[PDB]
mmCIF file with all atom_site columns, C-alpha atoms and ligand atoms in Angstrom:
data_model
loop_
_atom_site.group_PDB
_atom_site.id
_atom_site.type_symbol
_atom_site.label_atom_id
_atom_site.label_alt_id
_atom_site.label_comp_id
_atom_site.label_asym_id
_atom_site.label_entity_id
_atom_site.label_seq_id
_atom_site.pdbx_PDB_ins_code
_atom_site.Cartn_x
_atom_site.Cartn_y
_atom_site.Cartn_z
_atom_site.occupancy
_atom_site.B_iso_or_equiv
_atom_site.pdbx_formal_charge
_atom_site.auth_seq_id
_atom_site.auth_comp_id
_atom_site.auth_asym_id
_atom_site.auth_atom_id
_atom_site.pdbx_PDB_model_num
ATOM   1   C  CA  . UNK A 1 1   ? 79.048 85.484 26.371 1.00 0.00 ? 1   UNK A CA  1
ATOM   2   C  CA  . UNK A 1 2   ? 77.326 88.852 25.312 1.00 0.00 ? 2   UNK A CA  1
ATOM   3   C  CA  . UNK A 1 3   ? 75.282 87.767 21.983 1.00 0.00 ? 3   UNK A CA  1
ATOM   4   C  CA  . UNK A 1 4   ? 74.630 89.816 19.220 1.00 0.00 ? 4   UNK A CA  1
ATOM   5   C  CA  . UNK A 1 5   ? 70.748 90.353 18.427 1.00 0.00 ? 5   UNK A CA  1
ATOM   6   C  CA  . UNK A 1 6   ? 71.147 88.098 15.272 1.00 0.00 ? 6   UNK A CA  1
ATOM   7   C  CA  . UNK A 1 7   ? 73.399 85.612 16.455 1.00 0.00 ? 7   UNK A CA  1
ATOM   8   C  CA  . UNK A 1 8   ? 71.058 84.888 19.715 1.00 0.00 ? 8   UNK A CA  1
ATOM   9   C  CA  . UNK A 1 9   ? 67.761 84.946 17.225 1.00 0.00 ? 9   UNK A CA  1
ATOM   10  C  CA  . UNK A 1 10  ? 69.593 82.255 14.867 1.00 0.00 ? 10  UNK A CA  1
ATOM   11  C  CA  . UNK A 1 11  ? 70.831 80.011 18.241 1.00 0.00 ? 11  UNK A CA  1
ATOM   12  C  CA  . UNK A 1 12  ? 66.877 80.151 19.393 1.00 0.00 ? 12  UNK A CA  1
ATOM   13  C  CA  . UNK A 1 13  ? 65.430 79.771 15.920 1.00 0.00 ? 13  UNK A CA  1
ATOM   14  C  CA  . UNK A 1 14  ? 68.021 76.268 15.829 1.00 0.00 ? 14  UNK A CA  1
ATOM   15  C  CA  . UNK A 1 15  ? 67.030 75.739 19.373 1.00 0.00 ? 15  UNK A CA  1
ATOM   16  C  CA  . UNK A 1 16  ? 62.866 75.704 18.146 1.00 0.00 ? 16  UNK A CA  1
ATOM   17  C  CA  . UNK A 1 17  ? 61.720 78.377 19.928 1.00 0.00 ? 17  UNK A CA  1
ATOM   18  C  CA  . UNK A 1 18  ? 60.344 79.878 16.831 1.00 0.00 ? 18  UNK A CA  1
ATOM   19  C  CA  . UNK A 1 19  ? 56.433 80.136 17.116 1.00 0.00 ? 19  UNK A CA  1
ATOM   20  C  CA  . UNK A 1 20  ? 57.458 77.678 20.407 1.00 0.00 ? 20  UNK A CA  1
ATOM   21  C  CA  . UNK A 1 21  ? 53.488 77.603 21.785 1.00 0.00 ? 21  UNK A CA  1
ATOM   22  C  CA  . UNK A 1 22  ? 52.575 80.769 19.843 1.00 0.00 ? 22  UNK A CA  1
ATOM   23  C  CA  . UNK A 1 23  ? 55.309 82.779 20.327 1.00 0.00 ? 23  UNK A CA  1
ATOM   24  C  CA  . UNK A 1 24  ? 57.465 84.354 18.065 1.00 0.00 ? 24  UNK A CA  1
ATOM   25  C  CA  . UNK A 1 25  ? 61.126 84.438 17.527 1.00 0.00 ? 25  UNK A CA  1
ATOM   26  C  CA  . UNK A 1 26  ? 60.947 88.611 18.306 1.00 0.00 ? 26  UNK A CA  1
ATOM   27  C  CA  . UNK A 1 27  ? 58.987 87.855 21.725 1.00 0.00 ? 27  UNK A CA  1
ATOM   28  C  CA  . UNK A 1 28  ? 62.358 85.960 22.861 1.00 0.00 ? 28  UNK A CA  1
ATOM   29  C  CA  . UNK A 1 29  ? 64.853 88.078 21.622 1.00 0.00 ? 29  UNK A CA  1
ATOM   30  C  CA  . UNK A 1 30  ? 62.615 91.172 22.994 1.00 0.00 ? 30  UNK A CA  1
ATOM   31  C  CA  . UNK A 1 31  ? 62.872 89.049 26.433 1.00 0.00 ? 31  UNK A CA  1
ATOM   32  C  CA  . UNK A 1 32  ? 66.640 88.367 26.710 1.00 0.00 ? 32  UNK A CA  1
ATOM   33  C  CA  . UNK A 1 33  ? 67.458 91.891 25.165 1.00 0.00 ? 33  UNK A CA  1
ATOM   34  C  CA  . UNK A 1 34  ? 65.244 93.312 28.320 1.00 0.00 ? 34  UNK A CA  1
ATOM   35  C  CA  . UNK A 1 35  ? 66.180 90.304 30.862 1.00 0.00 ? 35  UNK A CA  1
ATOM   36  C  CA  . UNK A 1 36  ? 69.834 89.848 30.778 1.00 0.00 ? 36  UNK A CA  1
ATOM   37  C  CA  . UNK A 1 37  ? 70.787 92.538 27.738 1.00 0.00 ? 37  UNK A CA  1
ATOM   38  C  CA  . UNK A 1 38  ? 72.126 89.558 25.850 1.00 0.00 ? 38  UNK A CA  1
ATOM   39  C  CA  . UNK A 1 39  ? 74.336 88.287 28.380 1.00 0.00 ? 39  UNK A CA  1
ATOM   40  C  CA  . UNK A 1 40  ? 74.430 84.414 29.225 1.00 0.00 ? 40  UNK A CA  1
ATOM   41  C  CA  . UNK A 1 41  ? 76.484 85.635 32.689 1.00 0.00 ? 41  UNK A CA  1
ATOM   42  C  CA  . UNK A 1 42  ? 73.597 87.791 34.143 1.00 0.00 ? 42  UNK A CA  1
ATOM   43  C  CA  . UNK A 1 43  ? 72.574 87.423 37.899 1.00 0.00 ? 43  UNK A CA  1
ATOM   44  C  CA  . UNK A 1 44  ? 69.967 89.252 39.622 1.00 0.00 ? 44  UNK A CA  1
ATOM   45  C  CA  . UNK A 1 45  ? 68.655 88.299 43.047 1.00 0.00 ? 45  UNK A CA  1
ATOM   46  C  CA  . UNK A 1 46  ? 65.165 88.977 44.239 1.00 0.00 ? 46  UNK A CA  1
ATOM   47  C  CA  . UNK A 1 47  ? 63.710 90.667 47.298 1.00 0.00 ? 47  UNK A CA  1
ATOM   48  C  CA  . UNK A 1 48  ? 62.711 86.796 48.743 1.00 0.00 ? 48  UNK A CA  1
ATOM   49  C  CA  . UNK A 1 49  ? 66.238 85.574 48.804 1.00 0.00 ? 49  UNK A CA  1
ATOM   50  C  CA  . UNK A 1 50  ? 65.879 83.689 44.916 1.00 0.00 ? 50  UNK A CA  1
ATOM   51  C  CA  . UNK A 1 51  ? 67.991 84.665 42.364 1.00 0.00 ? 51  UNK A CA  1
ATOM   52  C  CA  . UNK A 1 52  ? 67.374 85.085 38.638 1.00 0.00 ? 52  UNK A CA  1
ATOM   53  C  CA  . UNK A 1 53  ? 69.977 83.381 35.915 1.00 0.00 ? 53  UNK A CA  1
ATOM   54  C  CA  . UNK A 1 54  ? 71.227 83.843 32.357 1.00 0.00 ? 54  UNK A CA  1
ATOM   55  C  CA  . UNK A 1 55  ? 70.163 85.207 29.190 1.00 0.00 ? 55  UNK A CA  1
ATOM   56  C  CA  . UNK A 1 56  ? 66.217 84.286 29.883 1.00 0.00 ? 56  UNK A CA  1
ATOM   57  C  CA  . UNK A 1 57  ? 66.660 85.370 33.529 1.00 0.00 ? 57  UNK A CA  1
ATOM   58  C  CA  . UNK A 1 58  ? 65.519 82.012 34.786 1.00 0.00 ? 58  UNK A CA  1
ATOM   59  C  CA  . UNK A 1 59  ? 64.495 81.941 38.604 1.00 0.00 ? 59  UNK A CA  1
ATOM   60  C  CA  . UNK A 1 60  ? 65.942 79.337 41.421 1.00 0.00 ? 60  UNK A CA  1
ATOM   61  C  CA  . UNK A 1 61  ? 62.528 79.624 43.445 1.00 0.00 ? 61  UNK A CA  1
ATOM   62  C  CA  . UNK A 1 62  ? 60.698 77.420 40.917 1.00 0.00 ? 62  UNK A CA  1
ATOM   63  C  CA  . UNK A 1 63  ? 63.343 76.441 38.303 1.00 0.00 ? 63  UNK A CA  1
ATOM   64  C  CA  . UNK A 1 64  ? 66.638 75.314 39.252 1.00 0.00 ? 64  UNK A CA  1
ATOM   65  C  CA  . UNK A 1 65  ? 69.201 74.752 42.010 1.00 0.00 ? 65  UNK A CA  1
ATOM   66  C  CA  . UNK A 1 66  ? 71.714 77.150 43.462 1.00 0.00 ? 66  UNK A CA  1
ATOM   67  C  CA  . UNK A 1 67  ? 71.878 75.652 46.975 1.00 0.00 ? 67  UNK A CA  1
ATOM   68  C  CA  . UNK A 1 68  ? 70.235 79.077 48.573 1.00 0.00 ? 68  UNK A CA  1
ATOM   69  C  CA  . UNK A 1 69  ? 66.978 79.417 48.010 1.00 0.00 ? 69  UNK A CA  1
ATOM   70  C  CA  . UNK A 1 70  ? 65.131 77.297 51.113 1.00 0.00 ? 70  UNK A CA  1
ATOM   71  C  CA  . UNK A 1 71  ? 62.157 75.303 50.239 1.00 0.00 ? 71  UNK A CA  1
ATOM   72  C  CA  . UNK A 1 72  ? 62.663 76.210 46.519 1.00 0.00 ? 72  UNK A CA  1
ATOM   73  C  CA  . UNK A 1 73  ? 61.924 73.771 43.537 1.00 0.00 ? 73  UNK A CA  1
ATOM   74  C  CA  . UNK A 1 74  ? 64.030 72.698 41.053 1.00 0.00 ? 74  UNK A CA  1
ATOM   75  C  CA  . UNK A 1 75  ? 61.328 71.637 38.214 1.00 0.00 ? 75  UNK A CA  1
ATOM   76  C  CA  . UNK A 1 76  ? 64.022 72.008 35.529 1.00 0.00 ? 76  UNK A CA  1
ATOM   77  C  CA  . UNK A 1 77  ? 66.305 69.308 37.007 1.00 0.00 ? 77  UNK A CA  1
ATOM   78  C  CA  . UNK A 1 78  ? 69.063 71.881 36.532 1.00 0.00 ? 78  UNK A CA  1
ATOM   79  C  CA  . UNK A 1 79  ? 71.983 73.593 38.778 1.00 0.00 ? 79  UNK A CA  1
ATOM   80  C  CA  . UNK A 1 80  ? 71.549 76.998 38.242 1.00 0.00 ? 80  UNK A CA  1
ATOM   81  C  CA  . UNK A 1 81  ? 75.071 77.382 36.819 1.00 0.00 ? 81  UNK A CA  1
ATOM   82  C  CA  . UNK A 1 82  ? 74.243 75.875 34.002 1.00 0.00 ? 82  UNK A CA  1
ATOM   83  C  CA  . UNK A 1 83  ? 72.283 78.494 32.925 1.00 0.00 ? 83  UNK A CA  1
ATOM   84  C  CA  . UNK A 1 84  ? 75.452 80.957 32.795 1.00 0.00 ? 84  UNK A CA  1
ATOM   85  C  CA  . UNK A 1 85  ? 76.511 78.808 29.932 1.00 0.00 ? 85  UNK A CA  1
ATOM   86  C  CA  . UNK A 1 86  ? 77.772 80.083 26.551 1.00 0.00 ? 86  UNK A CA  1
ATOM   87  C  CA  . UNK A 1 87  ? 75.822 77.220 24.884 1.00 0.00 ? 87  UNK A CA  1
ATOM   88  C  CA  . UNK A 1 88  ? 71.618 78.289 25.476 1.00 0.00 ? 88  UNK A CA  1
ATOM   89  C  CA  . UNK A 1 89  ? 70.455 74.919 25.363 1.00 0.00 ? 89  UNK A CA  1
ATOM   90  C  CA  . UNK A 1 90  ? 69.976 74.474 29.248 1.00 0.00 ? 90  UNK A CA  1
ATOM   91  C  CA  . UNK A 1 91  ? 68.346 77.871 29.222 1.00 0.00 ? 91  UNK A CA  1
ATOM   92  C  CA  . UNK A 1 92  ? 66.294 76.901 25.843 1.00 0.00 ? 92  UNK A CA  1
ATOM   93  C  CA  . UNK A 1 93  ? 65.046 73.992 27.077 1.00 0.00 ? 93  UNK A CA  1
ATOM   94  C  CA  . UNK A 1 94  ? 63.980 75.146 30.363 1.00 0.00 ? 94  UNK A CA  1
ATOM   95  C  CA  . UNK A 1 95  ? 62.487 78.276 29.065 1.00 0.00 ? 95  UNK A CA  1
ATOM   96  C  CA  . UNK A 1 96  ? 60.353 75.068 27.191 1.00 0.00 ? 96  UNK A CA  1
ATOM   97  C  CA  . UNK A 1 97  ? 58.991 73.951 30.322 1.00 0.00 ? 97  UNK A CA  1
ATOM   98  C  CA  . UNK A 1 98  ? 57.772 77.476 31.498 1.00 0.00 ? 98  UNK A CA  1
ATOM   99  C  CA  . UNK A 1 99  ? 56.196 78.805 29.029 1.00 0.00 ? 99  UNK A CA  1
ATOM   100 C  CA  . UNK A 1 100 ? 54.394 75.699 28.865 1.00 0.00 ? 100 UNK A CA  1
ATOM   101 C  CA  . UNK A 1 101 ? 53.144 75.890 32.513 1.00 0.00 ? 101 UNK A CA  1
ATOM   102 C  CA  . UNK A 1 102 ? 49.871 78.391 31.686 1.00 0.00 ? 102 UNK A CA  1
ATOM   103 C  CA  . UNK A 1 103 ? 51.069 82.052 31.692 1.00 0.00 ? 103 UNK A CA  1
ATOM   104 C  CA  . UNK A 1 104 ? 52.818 81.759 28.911 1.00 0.00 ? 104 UNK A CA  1
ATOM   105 C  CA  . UNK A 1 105 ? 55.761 84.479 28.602 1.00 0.00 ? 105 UNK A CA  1
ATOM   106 C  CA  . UNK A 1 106 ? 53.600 86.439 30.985 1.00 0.00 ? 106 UNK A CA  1
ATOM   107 C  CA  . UNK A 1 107 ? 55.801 84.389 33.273 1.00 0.00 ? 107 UNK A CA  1
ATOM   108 C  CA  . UNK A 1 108 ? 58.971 86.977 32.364 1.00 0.00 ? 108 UNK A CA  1
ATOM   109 C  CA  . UNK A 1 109 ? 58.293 90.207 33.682 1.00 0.00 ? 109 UNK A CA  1
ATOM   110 C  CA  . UNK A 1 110 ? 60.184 92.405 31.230 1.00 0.00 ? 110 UNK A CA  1
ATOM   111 C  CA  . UNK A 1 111 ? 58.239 91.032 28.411 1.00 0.00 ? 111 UNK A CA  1
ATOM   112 C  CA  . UNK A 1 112 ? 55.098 91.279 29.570 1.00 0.00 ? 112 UNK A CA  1
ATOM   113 C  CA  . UNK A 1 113 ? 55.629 95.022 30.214 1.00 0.00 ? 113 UNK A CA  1
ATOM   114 C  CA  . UNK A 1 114 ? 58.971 95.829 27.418 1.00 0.00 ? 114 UNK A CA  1
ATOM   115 C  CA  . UNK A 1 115 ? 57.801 93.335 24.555 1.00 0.00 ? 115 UNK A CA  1
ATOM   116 C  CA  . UNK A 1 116 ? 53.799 92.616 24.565 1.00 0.00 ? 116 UNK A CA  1
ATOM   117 C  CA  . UNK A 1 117 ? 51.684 94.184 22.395 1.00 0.00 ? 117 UNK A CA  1
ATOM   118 C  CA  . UNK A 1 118 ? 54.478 95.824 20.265 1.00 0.00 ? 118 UNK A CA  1
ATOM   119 C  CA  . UNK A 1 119 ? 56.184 95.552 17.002 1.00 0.00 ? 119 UNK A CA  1
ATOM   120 C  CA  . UNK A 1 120 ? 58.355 92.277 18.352 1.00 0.00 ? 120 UNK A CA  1
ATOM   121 C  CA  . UNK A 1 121 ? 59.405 91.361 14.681 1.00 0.00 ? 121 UNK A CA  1
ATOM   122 C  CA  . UNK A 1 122 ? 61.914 94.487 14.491 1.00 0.00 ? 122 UNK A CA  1
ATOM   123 C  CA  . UNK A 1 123 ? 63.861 92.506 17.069 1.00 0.00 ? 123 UNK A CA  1
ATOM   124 C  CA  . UNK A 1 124 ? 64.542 90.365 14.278 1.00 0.00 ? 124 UNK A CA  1
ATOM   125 C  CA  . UNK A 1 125 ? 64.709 92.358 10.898 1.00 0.00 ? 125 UNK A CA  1
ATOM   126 C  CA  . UNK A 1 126 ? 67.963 92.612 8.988  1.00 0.00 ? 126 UNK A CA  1
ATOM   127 C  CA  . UNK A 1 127 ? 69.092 89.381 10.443 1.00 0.00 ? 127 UNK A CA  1
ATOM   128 C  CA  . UNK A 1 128 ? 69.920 86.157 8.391  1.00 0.00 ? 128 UNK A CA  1
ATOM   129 C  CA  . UNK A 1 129 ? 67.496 83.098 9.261  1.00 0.00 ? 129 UNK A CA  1
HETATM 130 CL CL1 . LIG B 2 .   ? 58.807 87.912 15.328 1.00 0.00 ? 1   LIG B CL1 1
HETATM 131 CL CL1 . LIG B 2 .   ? 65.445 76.003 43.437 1.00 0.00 ? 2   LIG B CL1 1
HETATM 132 CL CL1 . LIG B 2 .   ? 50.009 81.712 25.718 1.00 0.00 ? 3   LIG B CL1 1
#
């Protein structure tokens, strides 16, 4: 599913990732607009053989299981295909659990250099929450 920017900020707001450890709702709608461009289907893999999944772009070195990435955790308890999902929640809830771990959303790359330390709140204005 391709969301629209005010559709996916009402699914996370319902999800509680609103002000989720500090963050904003526009810091995770700045994320998947730059990670996946709103698409739950998105795949990228890296140079080290992992691969990167869904709207929050959600790595199988640390994160989940796709059955490819050797020595790799799965600290999400997850197959990566649920991450594809038109329903967020598996991507929600792990997204939880790594912005909990200490770097905060520094963990997603496009954020930390698309999204911080701008104007993240336009990423949500006009929309109906
Ligand atoms: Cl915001
Ligand atoms: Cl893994
Ligand atoms: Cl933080």
């Amino acid at each position: 599913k391709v969301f629209g920017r005010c559709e996916l900020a009402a699914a996370m707001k319902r999800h509680g990732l609103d002000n989720y450890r500090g963050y904003s709702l526009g810091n995770w709608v700045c994320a998947a607009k730059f990670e996946s461009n709103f698409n739950t289907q998105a795949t990228n893999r890296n140079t080290d053989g992992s691969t990167d999944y869904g709207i929050l772009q959600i790595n199988s070195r640390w994160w989940c299981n796709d059955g490819r990435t050797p020595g790799s955790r799965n600290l999400c308890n997850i197959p990566c295909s649920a991450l594809l999902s038109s329903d967020i929640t598996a991507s929600v809830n792990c997204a939880k659990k790594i912005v909990s771990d200490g770097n905060g959303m520094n963990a997603w790359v496009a954020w930390r250099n698309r999204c911080k330390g701008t104007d993240v709140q336009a990423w949500i204005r006009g929309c109906r929450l």
